[PDB]
């Protein structure tokens, strides 16, 4: 510890909200990752699992669940500005097999913004492409595509599957083999691989039993990331430009515009994938704008749509039985931060506590 030192007064501040948070949640481990300033600092806590004990180190790897989501998107985004895809053009014209159905009437732009209708849960039962086809080619919303935003699985499923045909690939090669690695994301992982396996943290669940997320049908597009700390970082700095990122044009353009704001729902503005609020915020109005999981609300367009702005808040929640985990960042401060825990904690705590640490800086 140093006084006037960067990284031990942000130090003092994390410790001062982390230790609790996972004293009073019984976290086993975390990893709290903060830029500010062009610089980064990694707090990591505790356990990644308990037998054998093992320390959560730099490299421990954690699920991130709906933070998958912003991949997908990311994904889409870069489809859409290589021009392979249109987020206006319907589910159906990208997926054949689905014309004649109600997809002819969903955009790629609702399955983005969770505003088709889809539910949250892919049906337990559907276990290939043949039996997702028939479900979707069956399917109907209770209210047209475009009125409401109900958060999505399926709809980020279709989403990223969409994007990663329409550049040639499986989404699975798109995310591993072309987005990740453009971001500089060499910890970052769809399937965990065997030098990997030591450091990939043990989740903890309700009842305190060590799991990790099975991964179902259309689940790396909806929940599949597991990653370090350090490599979300990364992601948000170059969501905030801040990053050389190895001079990819289209993926700077691609990341920014993800941030694109398309309709308004309650206190946030849905983006793809991504969520905002005004900056600055007040915690009541950011703690309603992160209990929109499971419930559906009415949505607004935002046309034209509103550019990637500064002055905002960006954020996703992610969890599975397992995890808990939370992005924020205020590109107008250059700021944000990366809270990963191997518990799922409610998502009240998540935000409190990133908002007090962003505060502080």
Same mark, same amino acid.
């Given at each position: ?8 007064? /942000? ?6 909200? /982390? ?36 320390? &959560? ?14 991949? @997908? @998107? ?16 319907? &589910? ?13 009437? &969903? ?217 808990? @985990? ?14 990963? @825990?191997?518990?799922?904690?409610? /998502? ?14």
């Amino acid at each position: 510890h140093h006084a006037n030192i960067d990284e031990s007064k /942000i130090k003092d501040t994390v410790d001062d909200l /982390i230790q609790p948070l996972m004293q009073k949640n019984n976290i086993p481990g975390m990893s709290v990752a903060v830029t500010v300033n062009g610089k980064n600092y990694i707090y990591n806590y505790g356990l990644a699992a308990k037998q054998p004990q093992q320390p &959560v180190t730099e490299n421990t790897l954690f699920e991130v669940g709906s933070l998958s989501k912003t991949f @997908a @998107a990311t994904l889409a985004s870069y489809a859409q500005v290589s021009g392979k895809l249109s987020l206006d053009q319907s &589910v159906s014209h990208y997926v054949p097999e689905l014309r004649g159905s109600s997809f002819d009437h &969903v955009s790629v732009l609702n399955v983005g913004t969770h505003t088709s209708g889809l539910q949250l849960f892919m049906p337990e039962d559907i276990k290939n492409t043949t039996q997702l086809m028939a479900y979707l080619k069956a399917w109907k919303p209770a209210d047209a595509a475009g009125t409401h935003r109900v958060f999505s699985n399926i709809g980020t499923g279709l989403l990223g599957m969409i994007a990663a045909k329409s550049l040639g690939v499986s989404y699975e090669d798109a995310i591993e083999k072309t987005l990740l690695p453009q971001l500089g994301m060499h910890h970052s992982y769809l399937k965990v691989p065997a030098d990997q396996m030591e450091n990939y943290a043990w989740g903890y669940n309700k009842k305190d039993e060590p799991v990790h997320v099975n991964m179902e049908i259309l689940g790396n597009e909806a929940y599949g990331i597991k990653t370090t700390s350090s490599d979300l970082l990364r992601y948000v700095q170059a969501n905030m430009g801040q990053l050389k990122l190895d001079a990819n044009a289209k993926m700077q353009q691609a990341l920014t515009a993800t941030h694109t704001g398309y309709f308004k729902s309650g206190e946030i503005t849905q983006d793809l994938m991504w969520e905002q609020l005004p900056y600055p915020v007040s915690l009541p109005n950011l703690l309603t704008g992160n209990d929109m999981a499971m419930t559906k609300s009415v949505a607004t367009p935002i046309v034209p749509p509103l550019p990637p702005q500064e002055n905002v808040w960006i954020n996703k929640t992610g969890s599975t039985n397992g995890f808990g @985990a939370y992005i924020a960042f205020v590109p107008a401060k250059k700021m944000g931060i990366v809270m990963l @825990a191997n518990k799922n904690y409610s /998502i009240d705590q998540r935000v409190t506590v990133a908002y007090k640490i962003l505060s502080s800086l």
